[PDB]
Amino acid sequence: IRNVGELIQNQVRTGLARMERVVRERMTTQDVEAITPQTLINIRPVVASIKEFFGTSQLSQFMDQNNPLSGLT
Amino acid sequence: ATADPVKDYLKQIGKVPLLNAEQEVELAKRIEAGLFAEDKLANSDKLAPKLKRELEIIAEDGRRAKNHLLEANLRLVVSLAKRYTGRGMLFLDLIQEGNLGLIRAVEKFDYTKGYKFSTYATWWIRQAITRAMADQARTIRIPVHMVEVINKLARVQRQMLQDLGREPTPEELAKELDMTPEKVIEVQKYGREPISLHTPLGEDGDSEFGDLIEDSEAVVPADAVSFTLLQEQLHSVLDTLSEREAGVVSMRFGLTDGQPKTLDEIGKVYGVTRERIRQIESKTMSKLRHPSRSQVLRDYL
Amino acid sequence: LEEIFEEISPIEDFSGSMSLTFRDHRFEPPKNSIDECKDRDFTYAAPLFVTAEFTNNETGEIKSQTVFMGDFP
């Protein structure tokens, strides 16, 4: 069972993989001494993935609140 | 000839001789030699046949060296196509557009610049690629200068999010862009992309979005039939009026033809003066305003 | 989270001169209350900061700076 922790971890891992590729590309096209950790990392992929995680996912389901037992189930 | 045609394109590049400094400077030398050869051939003054053939041969050799240069730079252009892949344009299409930029650049390159061809070309390659992306990427075409406006505001807004760590307020963005907020909202709304109808609704796998949104061009049967009943009732009401009165009001309001005629405009076929016809128009409007011929038409609005 | 961060080793260019270490991650309290989020249509989230350390052998210097990768649901 991929508990929710592992699901979100896989998604943020994919996002950080895109971040890694982006920062490597930036490194290949950046000069030295003008490089700071603040500027090089693009936060777009991680947020875009953890936000698209909920969307288009067969696992992020609309909660059903018909009654507390529907919730637990 | 295989799936993923870009692989076959890369193989079609194959192995071609990369050019070191002396090689491409000599290639450019005989390129311009062929250039003057074809220039001399283009002139109308008579030249000896053998000399003309020699000039044509030199121009042909220049052409061959041109294609040598293009095949050598195919690798650079595909690299620069990578550099802008994944923005709504297919990778091979970006490669081809960059190749168009490349043929432009070689058509505008010579050794007179004390630099390698690689440094000079990349500007034109990026130019052609970005022009193509601006003019052919989005479903609803956006002008190039709107394109740079939207990409500028997008990238600077990304910088604002990166710095402040929070969604910037529209006024702060407006002042940073130096434009007013209304332009900010305008370009923000213009910088969208369509959503495809043929997508699963997601409520059910079978259902698709294009089968859930209603049209406006449909003639609602209730409205059409109500309009027809209004037409019949109104025409009957005018038939209640005198023949001349009903006719003149009809032309004044064009029940017979989609264009109503001005009062003077009615006073040509009927043979009445603009003030006379006006007086009867006033008379018709009064008569249809009595409560007799008003109960029926009140409800139809 | 710290596991997936530690998985991404500091990036090395072709020269391997520079490196970015994601040592420590941290949270801050969310700005919006749960009831507020439900009512105003806001994704319940909190900030997630992480300390990025730039180290270059050529410069022989270490520059530490905290960065923020976005709201975390």
Place this chain on the structure above:
Amino acid sequence: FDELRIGLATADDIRQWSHGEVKKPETINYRTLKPEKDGLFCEKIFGPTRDWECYCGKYKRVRFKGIICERCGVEVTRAKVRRERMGHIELAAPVTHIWYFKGVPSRLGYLLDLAPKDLEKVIYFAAYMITFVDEERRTR
């Protein structure tokens, strides 16, 4: 309704169906939300977006229908004509219908005695054909 004859649509037939020619990828101006000229959705070729209305605004009314205003070339008529009228794209270099090839041999038919690999290689620009030889000339 007695028979739905179906067959191969030749180029001349396609030209006959067409009421114009598409020349751009334009769809709609980002600001005016109206169809562009000579592209997809063009009113000059397919039909008016609004009943009897032209693009320039000349001759909008239902009265003077059945005319073509010289300004934008729109023929005033019902919008329903757009559901029927069709255009055509001219291709600089000919291409081959995907359907009749790349399938079972009852539709490709082996009309040319060439293996499917040969066709897959040749029409996709990976190998040449000797279309014609003056073999009598070569022999003489």
Place this chain on the structure above:
Amino acid sequence: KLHHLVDDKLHARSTGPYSMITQQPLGGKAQFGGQRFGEMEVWALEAYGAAYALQELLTIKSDDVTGRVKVYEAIVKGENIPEPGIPESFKVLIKEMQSLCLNVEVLSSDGMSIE
């Protein structure tokens, strides 16, 4: 008490919205959507031999733009129902198959047919 309450399930339609690409009525309850007369329904009707009912259920009551306003007018005026025309979905198909380079020409026994 389960959540299959009748108030949710109850739906009806005299005439309402329609789809765009094909002029047939759209589905769902929120949009006044007619129930689907699927393939098995026409199989049953053909089994009964009731051909006129199938014709009206397939042309007048949907998929014919010229017929819908006509039938509404005929009913309210009391006039007898008019003759159904050709459905629009078939025209959509004819154009689409004409866009694949198949000249699907409707023909009559004596030359060209009138439509």
Place this chain on the structure above:
Amino acid sequence: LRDRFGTYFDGSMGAAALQKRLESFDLDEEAERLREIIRTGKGQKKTRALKRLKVVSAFLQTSNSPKGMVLDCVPVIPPDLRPMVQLDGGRFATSDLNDLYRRVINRNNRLKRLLDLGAPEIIVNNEKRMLQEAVDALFDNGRRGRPVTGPGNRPLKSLSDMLKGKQGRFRQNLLGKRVDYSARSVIVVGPQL
């Protein structure tokens, strides 16, 4: 071959070669020789000749010429059948045919641009290849290799894709349609009826 000897063998490349071959094809002689082969033939060669005779005879009896295999002009679906309908919220709603027609128009225009100016053989050949690939997609997206995914979330729809399958026009909007003057509801038992 071309350099060592020209003016004797005429050679070509791509669909244009197919067009030339079909223009110069003499199917009657093929039918005659294949009939001769069937009269005296053995093995699977006989079956291949059978299929070949079937198709060539079908074409010979019909008046329409074989050159219809290679289409020169691509018909376009009328716009209302591929609606770019306005959608509330400043958004848009588009059908994938719009995308495919845009691609084929782009590639045809760019090929025209390349042909106008002096261009090599490699670039023009690759461009014609992309044109053929784009047209392939419009008529059948996904019949070769990966389909034209467009947005990347899903293969784009295609002309023939509308004409096939459970969701195809045939089995969903011509045999079974929705109908006006209809309703639905839960059912209960009433015995007194």
